[PDB]
Structure formats: structure tokens, C-alpha cells
């Protein structure tokens, strides 16, 4: 009578896994995206006699840090980081966040933004002089040349804050930015200092890293697992009916 | 949870939305039309 609940848990968590996979597939064109991993954990129920009931719980263990494919766009402000490297932005709630989106934009007032989040430099958020032409070097250095002026007068303005962090040290926040895990925060500090060993390419944008093969295989597996759980539910549903209706 | 094993935790996304479409302000090429009324701009400037 309670195997129906085990099968129902399996089917519901299969639905959750399918939702995760569909959300990953919907962002196949999102610039600088990290796919969410999915794994079904097994929770064994601990009673006294025979733990013959073990349930299923869907989980998302971090994300995927494999870089995607770089689109070469003839623009100086689109940048791509090294493998396992992160650009730093000031988060929505006045905090710090890390990202791979190298689509740096400028405003009328001259401040650099990523998705609307101001970028964080050595001295705080980076502000470029109003209406200047901007070039980004291979180590984060930013040069600004005023329009209609000799290129000789170009001068550096600041340096981007580029950090290095692996998947174990990084957890996705609800606003799409990545942050440090508590266990990584305890060791590497609240704020990560700039890592000078990371090279950055200017003029190339990093796309998403969702793998179509894994997504399609996961969808097929989810469908089949759901059908099996429905069969288990149906088998349990007939037996209980007969039993009660007759042994009364 | 409080932490070997894999960091447990169900975190589900929502989808994808388009925020803003941006135009690439890069200098295009020049084509020769002998009409004296046509002018091309070498740089970032707009006729008002």
C-alpha cells in the first residue's frame, strides 16, 4: 500500500529532473552559461525490521564548468576568459558575484556593466571616461582613447578583476550569478583576490555549454523511467482494491 | 546540508528570457555612387 508512494516519489523526481533538463536546453543560446547537473539520490527509510523501502530525491549538484565555443565578434568589448576563470561583477544586492559573460557594455555616463551589473575592478567598480573608445588587454588592462584624438594619447584606465575558482568552490545563486560556497569561503576568504595567471581574449564571446547528446539521452531516460513508475503504481493500485473489497 | 559525497540540494531553474538586443557600431564599407548628394561618415557621428 506504500509502494505506490515510492513510485510516486520516483515519478515526481523524474518530472523535476526533466524540468532541470528542459531549463538547461532552453539556454542553448545564452551567452556564458553553465549547465545545471542533475542526479537522483537514494534515501533509505530507516525503520526497525526490513528497510525494503528506499525513496528517490532529485538533486542538482553544482553546475558544469566545461567552457563552450567562442564566437569571434569584431568588437573590442566582448571578452572570453581562460578555462576555470571568472569575471567579477557587483551583484544585485550590493554583493559580489562571478560570471563568464564577457559581454561588457558601457553607458552614457561611462560605467561598465555586464547584464546591467557594474563590473568590479581593483579600486572598486570600473568607470570609463564618458564616450570613449575602449580596448581590453590580454590580462585585464583597460585602455581608453577619446574619439577624434591621436591614438598616441591612449592610456590605461584600470584593470578587470579576474579570479580562478573550480566547481567545488562555486555555487549558483538564484539571480544567475555564481558565488563561493561556505566551505570555500572559510578557506579562500570572503573576497577572492585577483589571479594574475589568467589570460583573457578580447573580441570573442563565450556561449553556453549544454551538451545536446546528454540532454537527449536524459530525456529518453526520464520518459522510460516515468513509464516504469506508472506501471508500478497501476500494479499496486489493482492489488489493494482486490484485497480490501474481498477480505472485508 | 552541512558537509566523500556530492553536495545534495535541489535547485531548479525557470527558463530563458530576452533582455535587450544590441547593435554593433562598427564602421561599414564605402560604395561609390557618383551622386554628389551622398556622403559617408568616417567615425562615430550621426546626422541630426
Amino acid at each position: 500500500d506504500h509502494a505506490i508512494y515510492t513510485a510516486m516519489g520516483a515519478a515526481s523526481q523524474t518530472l523535476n529532473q526533466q524540468a532541470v533538463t528542459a531549463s538547461n536546453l532552453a539556454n542553448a543560446s545564452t551567452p556564458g552559461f553553465r549547465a545545471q547537473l542533475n542526479a537522483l539520490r537514494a534515501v533509505p527509510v530507516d525503520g526497525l525490521s526490513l528497510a525494503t523501502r528506499t525513496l528517490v530525491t532529485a538533486s542538482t549538484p553544482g553546475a558544469d564548468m566545461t567552457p563552450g565555443q567562442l564566437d569571434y565578434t569584431s568588437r573590442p568589448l566582448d571578452v572570453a576568459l581562460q578555462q576555470d576563470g571568472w569575471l567579477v561583477v557587483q551583484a544585485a544586492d550590493g554583493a559580489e558575484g562571478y560570471t563568464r559573460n564577457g559581454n561588457i557594455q558601457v553607458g552614457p555616463t561611462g560605467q561598465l556593466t555586464i547584464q546591467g551589473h557594474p563590473v568590479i575592478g581593483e579600486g572598486g567598480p570600473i568607470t570609463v571616461p564618458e564616450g570613449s573608445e575602449i580596448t581590453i588587454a590580454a590580462d585585464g588592462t583597460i585602455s581608453a582613447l577619446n574619439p577624434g584624438d591621436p591614438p598616441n594619447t591612449v592610456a590605461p584606465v584600470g584593470r578587470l578583476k579576474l579570479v580562478k575558482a573550480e566547481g567545488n568552490e562555486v555555487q549558483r545563486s538564484d539571480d544567475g550569478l555564481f558565488r563561493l560556497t561556505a566551505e570555500a569561503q572559510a578557506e579562500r576568504g570572503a573576497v577572492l583576490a585577483a589571479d594574475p595567471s589568467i589570460r583573457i581574449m578580447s573580441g570573442v564571446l563565450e556561449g553556453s555549454n549544454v551538451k545536446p547528446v546528454e540532454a537527449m539521452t536524459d530525456m529518453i531516460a526520464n520518459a522510460r523511467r516515468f513509464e516504469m513508475q506508472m506501471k508500478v503504481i497501476t500494479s499496486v493500485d489493482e492489488n489493494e482494491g482486490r484485497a480490501n473489497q474481498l477480505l472485508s | 546540508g552541512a558537509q566523500t559525497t556530492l553536495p545534495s540540494g535541489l535547485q531548479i531553474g525557470t527558463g530563458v528570457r530576452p533582455v535587450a538586443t544590441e547593435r554593433l557600431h562598427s564602421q561599414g564599407n564605402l560604395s561609390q555612387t557618383n551622386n554628389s548628394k551622398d556622403v559617408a561618415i568616417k567615425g562615430q557621428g550621426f546626422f541630426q
Binding site: 506504500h2 510516486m8 516519489g9 515526481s12 534515501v43 525513496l55 | 546540508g1
Partner: peptide, 16 residues
Amino acid sequence: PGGVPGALSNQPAPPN
């Protein structure tokens, strides 16, 4: 002490 019957109390609850 009873509780919510069915789906809520038969799905793996959060730790705390």
C-alpha cells in the same frame, strides 16, 4: 502528533 497526510510527509524532507 499527526501531521500532513500523503505527498508532503512521504517525500524526503529538508534536513532541518
